[PDB]
Design a protein around this nucleic acid. Structure first.
Ligand SMILES: Nc1ccn([C@H]2C[C@H](O)[C@@H](COP(=O)(O)OP(=O)(O)OP(=O)(O)O)O2)c(=O)n1
Ligand SMILES: [K+]
Ligand SMILES: [Mg+2]
Ligand SMILES: [Zn+2]
Ligand SMILES: [Zn+2]
Ligand SMILES: [Zn+2]
Length: 865
DNA sequence: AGGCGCTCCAGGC
């Protein structure tokens, strides 16, 4: 024969222009060059695969009555061959009887049955989905895409090594890869698992734009990029994260570069290419992408801005070879990240903004905010305006260029810090989907792929693809809290992986629960574990392993964070598997199952509450799978004993479900359901312990209150949870608030602390009642005013100012720059004292005797009425 | 395009 090895990373199909064809992109080892290069493998002749369900008794389609003659596969075969194939224009086909299982939402389909599997060219006509015949009542798989068929049939689960038997040459190159090959049929491709993965080429970049003087245009004037040619995903990121890099700077049109600039560059020796026109800059960038040939391109806000601006400018400046930004040679450039994801076809796009949203929580996911929270460094901002003045002098243009470079580096460092790529790979090998899709975010597509593989594997027919809202069923139970402050130790117990465990513990599955608002019945405990509990179980085991690793002897603070993020990622994946059951647009939608899981959960929480109470214990709170207890004790060692005691008593009732000691608090300020503060006990040696403050749901943790209000609220909390007597505390609180009130009025407070942040659920243009929505109003300004544009999902920062226009506070929202720059605008001190600080402190002091709302108003110098 | 539970604010009636 003849065979070659290929490590695939990305896949792509064009069902309209090239049905039955799948393009694979990956790596190949080239011995003569001792390096891996890119390769494109075009897989052809992927055939549609349909399953015809035979009727019990034959039917006549002209009368619509049975005939008395039963059915046999020969009957079905003949009908397809004689009437169906001929009527629908299917020249060739192959078929065979098979036995498949079914367990989904189409009524009148038996659990197990024999089917006539038919296969034919994807180039031939697609049969109607609701097609029926004389011998068959239903047909499955009429609309399955080639990519799905390929991945499922070949059992490909994320990036891996493949052997391609009998490769063919192509008359003409179809990609921008170094190597190419073609497979005439899918069965020539096989997964192999005994070859270590190859390292990848990773490219991180950033760009700068500039609004042009006259015409309205965002011109790209600088780009920076860092590259690593051997970035391994099965180990710690390389240090340093890049081996090379390059920069390119261009002039708008009317401007002229500072002189000696060239020399200044040769002098300081920076790998900077000074382009004369934007078109040149773009042509150069694309040439660099083609030559470097990255498997992964990383940026910040790529999908929302950068990528669209790049393609548009490439089109406007008529830059040469736009398709080099991807790995597939194309001609027509698509626009609007669909058209985008396609534009980079073959190259995975990692957007740290998107990845950060999935892995951690921030007040905003803008680059400065991320560099601060994750890299713990400050990032300078260069406003589009100041840009122009920079071209005037050499050092300025040079500074701007170094700045762009710094952003490319920040982006890359954030990617490594969050360990984004290894995580995305792990999730892709688990779900068996496509890595570039994993990186775009979303839990549903992954869960669908995970289930598709599992059901194909177990020989099941799967549903065909089909073509915040109000709750549609009951969820978790939240206990009514016993609001107040607590001095004695509090015990918090929480069940491990509750829902995933409930699914296993009661064997809930598409295959074991009868259904069709009514809660189904638990299946007979004799039945064998179903696909769902097994798959769910595997996600829980993986999570336990990672938690075991964290438990280990003295580890790095950086690594510990990575393990914690990963552990939560696996938690979210298992919970998303439960959630998709209740996702109306899910391919495996099964609401009764979702409702049964939540039902058992509330039941279990109620029983655990009543049980702790029978032990004569005080249950002051509980959320879905937790129980909070006031031990009233001051003896830590005793509390822990009591904890393990209740734990043991509870776990005694279940086969798999296990409750644990989530934590112990030294002091607790419980305000309302899902809202509390506390000093958390952290044992050291000899029953000794340190203590750490922890907030849950308070206004202090939200993004939509200013720092001034939030820092002040945190001060109060720190004082309340304190050792100090109630008296000393109340005094300190007053002492501090009176002070804050003065500082706000005398103008001692940094303008940044007045900023309020809110994310837009929709694009600012899609709001009818706009004007009175401060964040939507500042976004409409920002947008219509300059370069970048805010869209659904972005958070907007703003401040309330004195306009001198007597409109409501909500109608006097302005951008920070807009305030600092404009003179008629000034901070509305009254608004901040009464609508920000007062509301926050009042809710926090609500249960504290001695403080009161009226009082808090007088400290702030507000008229109590 | 994982689920549902529980505040908070602007404003008009
Ligand atoms: N993002 C989330 C968080 C929680 N839950 C549901 C399912 C969980 O099983 C249950 C309990 O919430 P937990 O925070 O306690 O999550 P788990 O108990 O499952 O994991 P852990 O072992 O960390 O407690 O609430 C969910 O569906 N989605
Ligand atoms: K009070
Ligand atoms: Mg839990
Ligand atoms: Zn081999
Ligand atoms: Zn709403
Ligand atoms: Zn919990």
């Amino acid at each position: 024969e003849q065979v070659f090895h290929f490590y695939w990373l990305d896949a792509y199909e064009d069902q309209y222009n090239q049905p039955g064809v799948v393009f694979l992109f990956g790596k190949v080892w080239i011995e003569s060059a001792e390096t891996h290069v890119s390769c494109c493998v075009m897989v052809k002749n992927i055939e549609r695969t349909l399953y015809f369900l035979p009727r019990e008794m034959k039917i006549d389609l002209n009368t619509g009555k049975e005939t008395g003659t039963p059915i046999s596969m020969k009957d079905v075969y003949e009908e397809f061959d004689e009437k169906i194939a001929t009527k629908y224009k299917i020249m060739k086909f192959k078929s065979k009887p098979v036995e498949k299982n079914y367990a989904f939402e189409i009524p009148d389909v038996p659990e197990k049955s024999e089917y006539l599997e038919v296969k034919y060219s994807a180039e031939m006509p697609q049969l109607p989905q609701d097609l029926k015949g004389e011998t068959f009542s239903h047909v499955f798989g009429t609309n399955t895409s080639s990519l799905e068929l390929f991945l499922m049939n070949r059992k490909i689960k994320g990036p891996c090594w493949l052997e391609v038997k009998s490769p063919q040459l192509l008359n003409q190159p179809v990609s921008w890869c170094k190597a190419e090959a073609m497979a005439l049929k899918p069965d020539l491709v096989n997964v192999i698992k005994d070859v270590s993965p190859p390292p990848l080429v990773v490219m991180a970049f950033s760009m700068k734009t500039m609004q042009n003087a006259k015409n309205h245009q965002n011109e790209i004037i600088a780009m920076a990029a860092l590259v690593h040619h051997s970035f391994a995903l099965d180990k710690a990121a390389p240090k340093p994260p890049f081996q090379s890099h390059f920069c390119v700077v261009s002039k708008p049109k009317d401007c002229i570069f500072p002189y000696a600039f060239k020399e200044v560059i040769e002098k300081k020796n920076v790998k900077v290419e000074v382009a004369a026109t934007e078109r040149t800059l773009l042509g150069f960038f694309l040439a660099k992408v083609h030559k470097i040939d990255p498997d992964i391109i990383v940026g910040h806000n790529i999908y929302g801005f950068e990528l669209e601006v790049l393609l548009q400018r490439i089109n406007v400046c008529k830059a040469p070879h736009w398709s080099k930004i991807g790995r597939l040679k194309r001609s027509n450039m698509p626009k609007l990240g669909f058209g985008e994801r396609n534009a980079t076809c073959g190259r995975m796009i990692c957007d740290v903004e998107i990845s950060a949203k999935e892995l951690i929580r921030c007040k905003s996911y803008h680059l400065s905010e991320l560099v601060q929270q994750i890299l713990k460094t400050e990032r300078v901002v260069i406003p589009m305006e100041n840009i122009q003045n920079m071209y005037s002098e050499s050092s300025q243009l040079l500074y701007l260029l170094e700045h762009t470079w710094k952003d490319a580096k920040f982006i890359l460092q954030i990617m490594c810090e969050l360990n984004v790529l290894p995580l995305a790979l792990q999730i892709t090998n688990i779900a068996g989907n496509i890595m570039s899709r994993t990186l775009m975010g979303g839990r549903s597509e992954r869960n669908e792929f995970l289930l598709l593989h599992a059901f194909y594997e177990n020989n099941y027919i799967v549903p065909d693809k089909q073509i915040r809202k109000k709750a549609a069923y009951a969820g978790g139970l939240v206990l009514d809290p016993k609001v107040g402050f607590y001095d004695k130790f509090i015990l918090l117990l929480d069940f491990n992986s509750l829902y995933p465990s409930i699914i296993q513990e009661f064997n809930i599955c598409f295959t074991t629960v009868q259904r069709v608002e009514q809660i189904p019945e638990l299946p007979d405990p004799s039945l064998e574990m179903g696909i769902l509990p097994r798959e769910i179980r595997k996600l829980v085991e993986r999570r336990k392993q990672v938690k075991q690793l964290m438990k280990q002897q003295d580890l790095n603070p950086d690594l510990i964070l990575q393990y914690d993020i990963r552990q939560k990622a696996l938690k979210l994946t298992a919970n998303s598997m439960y959630g998709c059951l209740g996702f109306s647009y899910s391919r495996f939608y099964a609401k009764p199952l979702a409702a049964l899981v939540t039902y058992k959960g509330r039941e279990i929480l109620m029983h655990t509450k009543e049980m702790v109470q029978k032990m004569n214990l005080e249950v002051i709170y509980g959320d879905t799978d937790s129980i909070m207890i006031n031990t009233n004790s001051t003896n830590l060692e005793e509390v822990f004993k009591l904890g393990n005691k209740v734990k043991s008593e509870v776990n005694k009732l279940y086969k798999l479900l296990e409750i644990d000691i989530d934590g112990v608090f030294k002091s607790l300020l419980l305000l309302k359901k899902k809202k509390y503060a506390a000093l958390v006990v952290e044992p050291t040696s000899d029953g000794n312990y340190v203590t750490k403050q922890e907030l849950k749901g308070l206004d202090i943790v939200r993004r939509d209150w200013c720092d001034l209000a939030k820092d002040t609220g945190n001060f109060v909390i720190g004082q309340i949870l304190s050792d100090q007597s109630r008296d000393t505390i109340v005094e300190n609180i007053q002492k501090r608030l009176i002070e804050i009130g003065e500082n706000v009025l005398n103008g001692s407070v940094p303008v940044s602390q007045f900023e309020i942040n809110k994310a837009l659920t929709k694009d600012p243009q899609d709001y009818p009642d706009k004007k009175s929505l401060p964040h939507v109003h500042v976004a409409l300004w920002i947008n219509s005013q300059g370069g970048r544009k805010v869209k659904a999902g972005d958070t907007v920062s703003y401040v309330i100012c004195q306009d001198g226009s007597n409109l409501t506070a909500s109608q006097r929202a302005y951008a920070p720059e807009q305030l600092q720059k404009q003179d008629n605008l000034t901070i509305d001190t009254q608004y901040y004292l009464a609508q920000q600080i007062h509301p926050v402190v009042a809710r926090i002091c609500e249960p504290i005797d001695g403080i009161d709302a009226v009082l808090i108003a007088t400290w702030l110098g507000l008229d109590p009425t």
